Write a protein that binds this ligand. Structure first.
Ligand SMILES: CN(CC[C@H](N)CC(=O)N[C@H]1C=C[C@H](n2ccc(N)nc2=O)O[C@@H]1C(=O)O)C(=N)N
Ligand SMILES: [Mg+2]
Ligand SMILES: [Mg+2]
Ligand SMILES: [Mg+2]
Ligand SMILES: [Mg+2]
Ligand SMILES: [Mg+2]
Ligand SMILES: [Mg+2]
Ligand SMILES: [Mg+2]
Ligand SMILES: [Mg+2]
Ligand SMILES: [Mg+2]
Ligand SMILES: [Mg+2]
Ligand SMILES: [Mg+2]
Ligand SMILES: [Mg+2]
Ligand SMILES: [Mg+2]
Ligand SMILES: [Mg+2]
Ligand SMILES: [Mg+2]
Ligand SMILES: [Mg+2]
Ligand SMILES: [Mg+2]
Ligand SMILES: [Mg+2]
Ligand SMILES: [Mg+2]
Ligand SMILES: [Mg+2]
Ligand SMILES: [Mg+2]
Ligand SMILES: [Mg+2]
Ligand SMILES: [Mg+2]
Ligand SMILES: [Mg+2]
Ligand SMILES: [Mg+2]
Ligand SMILES: [Mg+2]
Ligand SMILES: [Mg+2]
Ligand SMILES: [Mg+2]
Ligand SMILES: [Mg+2]
Ligand SMILES: [Mg+2]
Ligand SMILES: [Mg+2]
Ligand SMILES: [Mg+2]
Ligand SMILES: [Mg+2]
Ligand SMILES: [Mg+2]
Ligand SMILES: [Mg+2]
Ligand SMILES: [Mg+2]
Ligand SMILES: [Mg+2]
Ligand SMILES: [Mg+2]
Ligand SMILES: [Mg+2]
Ligand SMILES: [Mg+2]
Ligand SMILES: [Mg+2]
Ligand SMILES: [Mg+2]
Ligand SMILES: [Mg+2]
Ligand SMILES: [Mg+2]
Ligand SMILES: [Mg+2]
Ligand SMILES: [Mg+2]
Ligand SMILES: [Mg+2]
Ligand SMILES: [Mg+2]
Ligand SMILES: [Mg+2]
Ligand SMILES: [Mg+2]
Ligand SMILES: [Mg+2]
Ligand SMILES: [Mg+2]
Ligand SMILES: [Mg+2]
Ligand SMILES: [Mg+2]
Ligand SMILES: [Mg+2]
Ligand SMILES: [Mg+2]
Ligand SMILES: [Mg+2]
Ligand SMILES: [Mg+2]
Ligand SMILES: [Mg+2]
Ligand SMILES: [Mg+2]
Ligand SMILES: [Mg+2]
Ligand SMILES: [Mg+2]
Ligand SMILES: [Mg+2]
Ligand SMILES: [Mg+2]
Ligand SMILES: [Mg+2]
Ligand SMILES: [Mg+2]
Ligand SMILES: [Mg+2]
Ligand SMILES: [Mg+2]
Ligand SMILES: [Mg+2]
Ligand SMILES: [Mg+2]
Ligand SMILES: [Mg+2]
Ligand SMILES: [Zn+2]
Lengths: 141, 110, 84, 181, 53
RNA sequence: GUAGAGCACUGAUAGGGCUAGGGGGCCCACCAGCCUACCAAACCCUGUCAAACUCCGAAGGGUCCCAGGUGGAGCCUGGG
RNA sequence: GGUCGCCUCCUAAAAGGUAACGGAGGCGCCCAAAGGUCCCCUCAGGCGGGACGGAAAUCCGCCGGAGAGCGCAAGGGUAGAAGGGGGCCUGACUGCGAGGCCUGCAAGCCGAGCAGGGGCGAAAGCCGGGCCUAGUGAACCGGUGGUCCCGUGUGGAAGG
RNA sequence: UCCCCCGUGCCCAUAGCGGCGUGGAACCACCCGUUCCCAUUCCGAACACGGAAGUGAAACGCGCCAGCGCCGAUGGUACUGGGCGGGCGACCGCCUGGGAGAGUAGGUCGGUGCGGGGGA
RNA sequence: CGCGGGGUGGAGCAGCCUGGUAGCUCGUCGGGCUCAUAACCCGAAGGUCGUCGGUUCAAAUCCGGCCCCCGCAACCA
RNA sequence: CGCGGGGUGGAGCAGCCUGGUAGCUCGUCGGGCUCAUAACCCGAAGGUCGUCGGUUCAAAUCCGGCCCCCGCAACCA
């Protein structure tokens, strides 16, 4: 999993999600990255899920980079309880993701091989995705 | 970053400045002693009486007592009575003290 | 039913709003005494014709007109240029 | 301001060897003493018994001055400190009193220690000063024996206008410092 | 107040009428108080003390 | 002082360099060798997240002056 | 079950204000010094040195704008002091109070200036407690001390 | 009336840090002493007086450059007041005034106001 | 707020009632005896008689202030 | 979740309120007694006080959260 080992407050507000991403819009370490196309709350259990996927795809090899880190606490009321009497309890953590953000990028492996281990990676993901190539544009910022 | 010297200035300086009444700054080196009356609004000098321009010499303290009395004449003739005393980063005593007692007896008002 | 045996909270309060801020805006004609500004701390400093009470409440010392001056590193000041 | 033979030794001997050494231009920039802070940080009369100044009377017989106390900066459970207890003493020696102290230590007291073997030379500051310590207190016979009690010592810095540790040594060595190395 | 912090009316001497009242500690300084206080009654400055409240 | 944005402060943070400590070696076990595809503070680089973080900062909103504004506007004292 | 008054921050959408069994924390005290004033000092921290003596006891050196401190929670503030030390002190006065903040009411809050008589300071000045924002209770019924106002035909005393 | 120092403001780091040079003629600083006034929870360090042998080494004044600090547009984008639109929904997009923060090109080792002194 | 009685060794504690030594038994070390453990027997340890302050030749006993705990009696807008 | 309770030398109990104070009983190890064992007499040994983090100069102790143990409602017409 991926808890932030420590934190300033425990329960976090919910928040909107208006518009286009803030940063993380260019490859930076790998040579191929995975790109978000629609807003989301990606979960500690998904990030992990997608990661493990590729690692088991090119077993012994590559270097997986992971650009979004689940810091926000997903909160939720128990079952058979009604509205109010406290705010929900924490179960799991998430990372806010807008469209354009890179989430994974792998470095150093056969072009075919990265193009799969990032393809499979997307299916573990709750959203639409596009794989991308490191770029003159990317090295241009 | 600051020296205790310049802090003491501001300190002693700041208060007096808040009461509006005129300002008789007292500068003092190991050689001579100087002074000048200042309106701090416009930021201008009313009259300046110094040990060096007066060309006096013959013991530093007693030197000053005259330069104080000198300042009063050169200002009474101008119309100043009300003026509060700035004693710089110096303890009011002896040399600076003299300048005051001189200005005091010359008819000046603080 | 529906209500059963949950629980509650440990927190839940809040203090009475203090309604502070700048009370007089620059160019407002003031009587002597008007509170120009309410505050905690010195976010504004006492200028010409302006006092300060044991709660940093600045107040006009003579009739005139509020003026506002940001003198940078030594802060904002509030004065009154008494229309004579 | 007083006829002391070390004041005169610094001038009529130590001053020149330095100008011939590091080849100074101006006269003031030549290395020169400043103070000798002696810290008798006892830490043993905190909320402990009186008697603290019973050394700050012998401390006066050494240094000619009256030592003034030092208090507890902050409270510590492991030392038994509450923010305010007195732990030690400190005298700052300026002007000729400073000299005449060294004109007794450097050539009478330093040899009065048993198993003595010069001075530690790594202990120079970095911007031109030097210090160490001492344990035995009747190391100057101004403190005679039947003033007997528990023996305690002092931390001692010496402060100079030396600009580096290098030239600094040359001063302290030239004014009679036996160096262990 | 509580119990270690006692309440008290500042007494008097130069007319023996009380004219003030305040607070103090008896576990800190366990004596009788001390302040100069002009009075509307004697029209003079006087040294004052205490009695319970 | 918000949206944005930002990391200067309070914190989070993934990779890298540096690098106290800690752990596995192991030389050896008296002190000491300083060697580590292991952990890891403080720091530097790339790269990021925050209602109770802001080096910055909109549109906007408030309000006073001037002008337009004769309206089932406005203002005061009262009865329902 | 939890809650009920007051304070701090957030929610609150850049004036004020704003809800919820919304997220977080504090108060029901304390101080004759922690108050007044006149005077002087400047931090936390980091690296080198330092007999005991250490991660930190006291010491020396450069280094540093405030990340320390300011009684307690938090916020704003703050060294050009509000912080740290000393000398003298008691304005932790009385008789008042222009004008305003806030505001349904009742409340709460800020206050220049006048008189009286003091304090500290040569002095300009400053003091009607505390850096500020919590540290609390209407009316009724009584207790205590003054006043010398009322007191049932007059003077007392009882009582107000 | 230009120049140089001393005092003192105004501006609020384009002014600062660090660096190289530098000026004692006059001012200024260090400086000489500790009798006197004044001072140290110890010390003439500071503050204080009495002077004037030395020195501009320190501090400071003035010059030099961009290592740091700092100021930093234009173009464009974010967001947005007003007005509209297509989506089953998630959300996107259009006209209209407004328009950042980052970042780029760059700027900067100051500018000043009255008084005093001192040479053009 | 108002009335009753008090500390005396570390506890407990009459002495105090009555103006003359600070004390009974419980507790320590020591000796005795000791199956041991008991109880027992000898001995010393130990104190400022809440505090000042006072009447007296003198005080634990007596008076004033006070102080602190026990208790009692009421009242609580 | 929600109320409240206790976690401490091997077993079982104090010490928490009032923040610097590891206590008792077994048990254990090591000396005796006795032919031997227990009984019994004589010495010693032994725990960062559940656990993270907390406030104070420090935490058995004051302080928040999951980890345990334990009664513990949860009416559901
Ligand atoms: C049940 N009764 C008498 C009470 C009423 N007359 C009849 C009755 O059925 N009362 C019950 C009816 C519903 C009530 N109930 C239950 C669950 C719930 N969530 N809310 C409720 O009110 O619990 C009641 C209760 O026990 O009194 C007795 N045992 N005496
Ligand atoms: Mg989905
Ligand atoms: Mg001006
Ligand atoms: Mg609760
Ligand atoms: Mg509210
Ligand atoms: Mg309320
Ligand atoms: Mg300021
Ligand atoms: Mg001589
Ligand atoms: Mg110190
Ligand atoms: Mg009164
Ligand atoms: Mg890691
Ligand atoms: Mg090792
Ligand atoms: Mg190696
Ligand atoms: Mg290596
Ligand atoms: Mg780091
Ligand atoms: Mg974001
Ligand atoms: Mg925000
Ligand atoms: Mg900001
Ligand atoms: Mg605007
Ligand atoms: Mg207004
Ligand atoms: Mg009406
Ligand atoms: Mg309003
Ligand atoms: Mg005080
Ligand atoms: Mg100091
Ligand atoms: Mg320090
Ligand atoms: Mg030491
Ligand atoms: Mg140390
Ligand atoms: Mg603060
Ligand atoms: Mg102060
Ligand atoms: Mg002070
Ligand atoms: Mg004092
Ligand atoms: Mg006096
Ligand atoms: Mg009036
Ligand atoms: Mg009135
Ligand atoms: Mg009023
Ligand atoms: Mg009202
Ligand atoms: Mg007043
Ligand atoms: Mg307060
Ligand atoms: Mg104060
Ligand atoms: Mg208050
Ligand atoms: Mg109330
Ligand atoms: Mg009624
Ligand atoms: Mg009454
Ligand atoms: Mg009465
Ligand atoms: Mg009558
Ligand atoms: Mg200006
Ligand atoms: Mg250079
Ligand atoms: Mg040069
Ligand atoms: Mg050169
Ligand atoms: Mg030069
Ligand atoms: Mg020269
Ligand atoms: Mg002094
Ligand atoms: Mg001093
Ligand atoms: Mg120039
Ligand atoms: Mg260069
Ligand atoms: Mg630059
Ligand atoms: Mg632009
Ligand atoms: Mg747009
Ligand atoms: Mg508009
Ligand atoms: Mg619109
Ligand atoms: Mg669309
Ligand atoms: Mg450039
Ligand atoms: Mg420069
Ligand atoms: Mg010339
Ligand atoms: Mg009775
Ligand atoms: Mg008795
Ligand atoms: Mg006796
Ligand atoms: Mg227990
Ligand atoms: Mg105990
Ligand atoms: Mg046998
Ligand atoms: Mg047994
Ligand atoms: Mg609790
Ligand atoms: Zn009186």
């Amino acid at each position: 999993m991926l808890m932030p080992r420590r934190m300033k407050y425990r329960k976090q507000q919910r928040g909107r999600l208006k518009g286009a991403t803030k940063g993380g819009d260019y490859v930076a370490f790998g040579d191929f990255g995975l790109v978000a196309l629609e807003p989301a709350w990606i979960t500690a259990q998904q990030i992990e899920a997608a990661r493990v996927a590729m690692v088991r795809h090119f077993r012994r090899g590559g270097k997986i980079f992971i650009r979004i880190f689940p810091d926000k606490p997903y909160t939720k009321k128990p079952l058979e309880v009604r509205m109010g009497k406290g705010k929900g309890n924490v179960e799991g953590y998430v990372a806010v993701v807008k469209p354009g953000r890179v989430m994974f990028e792998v470095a150093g492996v056969t072009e075919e091989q990265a193009m799969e281990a990032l393809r499979i990676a997307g299916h573990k993901l709750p959203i639409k995705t596009k794989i991308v190539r490191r770029d003159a544009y990317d090295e241009a910022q | 970053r600051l020296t205790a010297y310049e802090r003491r200035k501001f300190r002693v300086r700041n208060r007096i400045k808040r009461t509006g009444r005129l300002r008789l700054s007292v500068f003092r080196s190991l050689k001579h002693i100087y002074a000048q009356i200042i309106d701090d609004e416009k930021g201008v000098t009313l009259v300046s009486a110094s040990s060096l321009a007066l060309k006096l010499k013959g013991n530093k303290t007693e030197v000053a007592r005259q330069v104080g009395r000198a300042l009063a004449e050169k200002a009474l003739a101008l119309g100043i009575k009300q003026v509060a005393f700035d004693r710089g980063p110096y303890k009011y005593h002896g040399r600076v003290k003299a300048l005051a007692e001189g200005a005091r007896e010359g008819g000046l008002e603080f | 039913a529906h209500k059963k045996g949950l629980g509650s909270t440990r927190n839940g309060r809040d203090s009475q709003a203090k309604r502070l801020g700048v009370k007089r805006y620059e160019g407002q004609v003031v009587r002597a005494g008007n509170i120009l500004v309410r505050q905690r701390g010195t976010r504004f400093k006492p200028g010409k014709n302006v006092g300060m009470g044991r709660d940093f409440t600045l107040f006009a010392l003579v009739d005139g007109v509020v003026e506002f001056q940001d003198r940078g590193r030594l802060g904002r000041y509030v004065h009154v240029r008494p229309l004579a | 301001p007083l006829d002391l033979a070390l004041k005169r030794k610094y001038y009529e001997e130590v001053r020149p060897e330095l100008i011939r050494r590091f080849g100074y231009q101006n006269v003031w920039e030549v290395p020169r003493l400043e103070k000798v802070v002696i810290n008798q940080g006892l830490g043993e009369a905190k909320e402990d018994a009186r008697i603290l100044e019973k050394a700050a009377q012998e401390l006066a017989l050494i240094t000619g001055q009256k030592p003034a106390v030092t208090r507890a900066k902050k409270s510590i459970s492991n030392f038994k400190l509450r923010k305010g207890m007195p732990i030690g003493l400190r005298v700052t020696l300026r002007r000729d009193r400073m000299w005449i102290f060294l004109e007794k230590l450097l050539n009478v007291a330093l040899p009065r220690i048993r198993d003595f073997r010069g001075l530690n030379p790594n202990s120079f500051d970095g911007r031109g000063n030097y210090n160490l310590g001492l344990r035995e207190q009747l190391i100057f016979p101004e403190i005679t024996y039947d003033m007997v009690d528990a023996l305690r010592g002092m931390d001692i810095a010496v402060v100079t206008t030396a600009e580096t540790d290098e030239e600094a040594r040359a001063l302290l060595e030239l004014l009679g410092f036996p160096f262990r190395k | 107040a509580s119990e270690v912090r006692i309440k008290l009316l500042l007494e008097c001497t130069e007319c023996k009428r009380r004219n003030y009242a305040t607070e103090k500690n008896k576990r800190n300084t366990p004596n009788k108080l001390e302040l100069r206080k002009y009075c509307p009654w004697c029209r003079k400055h006087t040294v004052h003390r205490e009695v319970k409240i």
